[PDB]
Amino acid sequence: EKQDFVQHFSQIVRVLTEDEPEIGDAIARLKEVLEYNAIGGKYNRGLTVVVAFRELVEPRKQDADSLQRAWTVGWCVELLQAFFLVADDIMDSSLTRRGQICWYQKPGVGLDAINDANLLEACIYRLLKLYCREQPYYLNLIELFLQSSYQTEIGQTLDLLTAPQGNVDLVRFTEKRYKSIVKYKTAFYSFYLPIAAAMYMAGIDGEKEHANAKKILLEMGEFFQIQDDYLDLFGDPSVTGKIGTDIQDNKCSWLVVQCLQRATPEQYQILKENYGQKEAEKVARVKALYEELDLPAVFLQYEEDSYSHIMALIEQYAAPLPPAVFLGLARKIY
Amino acid sequence: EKQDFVQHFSQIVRVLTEDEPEIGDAIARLKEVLEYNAIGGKYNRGLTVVVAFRELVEPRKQDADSLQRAWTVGWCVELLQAFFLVADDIMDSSLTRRGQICWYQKPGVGLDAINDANLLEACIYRLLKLYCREQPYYLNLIELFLQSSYQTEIGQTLDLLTAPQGNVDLVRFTEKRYKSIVKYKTAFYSFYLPIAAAMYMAGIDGEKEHANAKKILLEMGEFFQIQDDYLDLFGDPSVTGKIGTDIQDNKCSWLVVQCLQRATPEQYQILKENYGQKEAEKVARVKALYEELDLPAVFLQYEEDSYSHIMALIEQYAAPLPPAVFLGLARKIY
């Protein structure tokens, strides 16, 4: 299934590049931005649009063109992600992503990658218009993408407000605060977004149904960012494909929050003295305080308990949607 | 008229900030981003929406609420501009704007201002939904803002492709190329955008009419960027409110294009040896080559000839719109 999704990408780059004449060099650059930046991940968020589309729509309405609209809106979720990651990797001062150097760390790109990210966002709406203009769900999708863009930028704002360069923020790191950040920066666009899109494509616009689906899916995304945080420090970088910067970027990590509520006063000071600084030996002290506190073990328990809780929420809130929508998702993330 | 437009801004910040609870600090930050970044200019682009609204709509349909929608869509054109300038001042490595330091040069903002610009763009569509959701022109406006965002990002792309840091690009500087850049990066969102918005608000959706209005307005914006370029080097910075970076940023300026087509071979080499470098004495040599070539005089003639040409285009293409729409605009820019 991921094979057929990735092959559809060559067509979306054809249509996105078919505007060629005076703007020839800019189209080319956009091509190059698309290939470097949308390709290379797992495609879970975009495939999710398509998988749930097939589960929610009557197979007698799965026209070859309605299927193509589904492939395209899935790619739109991947361009959103790609827009946010490019910018995010500047702001976080990250080195690699998806096994290559962050695009803006490329000789000859640098801060021009701010335009480039902006262009990736613009492509969403060019795609929606080319494919979904005359569909009844056109405006609902535009509005969903825009709203999930806003929520994600609110989350980024808190993410950064909470993590100033060169400033001990330890007291700012609460669970309350952690949950607010990940709710907005991650849960909306990675989980609620692609399910909600498929739903509007299937003519399920009921407000209580999106709410119920959102109840489940926001908690899934909350787990997924907890996982992202854990793996920033403890993930095999030949697997994750990205070098981690949380500690040096002085971030409100699940890890630090959990550390802070188990640390002795002496341990608090090790963190105070060592967190949020670019010196490897400083980063190493924190990682070792985390390992001494048995945080990989705590993560593993939390992963078990969150899973049980998410499945209980599917029991409560999935109907009248097929549970398989939410269960295939949970399979993929846990 | 600019007084009543600027006073409406306090209400748009109220509504934009009325989402307050967990996201309290992010709303606050957004407030601060709005005030620093949307306030402080001349407001010509946003007022234009409102002025043309009053000229295009039947006064018996200028409800107090339809007038409020007009004020709000004008502010939406100013948030677009503000989104683009913030990012632009990073990418151009500018120092000041509107008489204060570029926002991202502010202690404690830096590259976080990438999120901030993104948030400013998102506010357009939050405003359109709060005020224009149930209007017949809702989707036409969303689509116009999005499309003018794309075109502007295509223009930025060429602007930068054409001006690499530390690389003699002289041969790349043509008129053909100059015109393509300013067409996209400036003409669409500063001139066609606000007139077209007012037009859709007045229920003038005719395709040939937008084309005709666009014929006039794209050339006005082409002049306006030529003016912007001239003033980057020759403008009183107590008036312009911004320090110029064109030469050091190795940019395809109207000035350089014009220089390059009048320079002697020896003069070409002065430019080759001196353009696109951060050394003040280097910048000074170029400025003096421009003054020796009598470019302020050439600009002044071009300003006269472009004006005559724009007014001839108004003769041809304004009908059935009131010429006053286009004439008030020309007054403001020349």
Ligand SMILES: O=P(O)(O)C(O)(Cc1cccnc1)P(=O)(O)O
């Ligand atoms: O991929 P990354 O940088 O680990 C991340 O997940 C990317 C990201 C970007 C925007 C919203 N949410 C997550 P972050 O929170 O920055 O750690």
Ligand SMILES: O=P(O)(O)C(O)(Cc1cccnc1)P(=O)(O)O
């Ligand atoms: O205000 P600036 O930087 O003079 C400018 O006009 C700003 C700008 C931003 C985006 C599109 N067009 C103009 P630029 O072309 O960068 O010189």
Ligand SMILES: [Mg+2]
């Ligand atoms: Mg990041």
Ligand SMILES: [Mg+2]
């Ligand atoms: Mg981040």
Ligand SMILES: [Mg+2]
């Ligand atoms: Mg991370």
Ligand SMILES: [Mg+2]
């Ligand atoms: Mg600039």
Ligand SMILES: [Mg+2]
């Ligand atoms: Mg610029």
Ligand SMILES: [Mg+2]
């Ligand atoms: Mg300029």
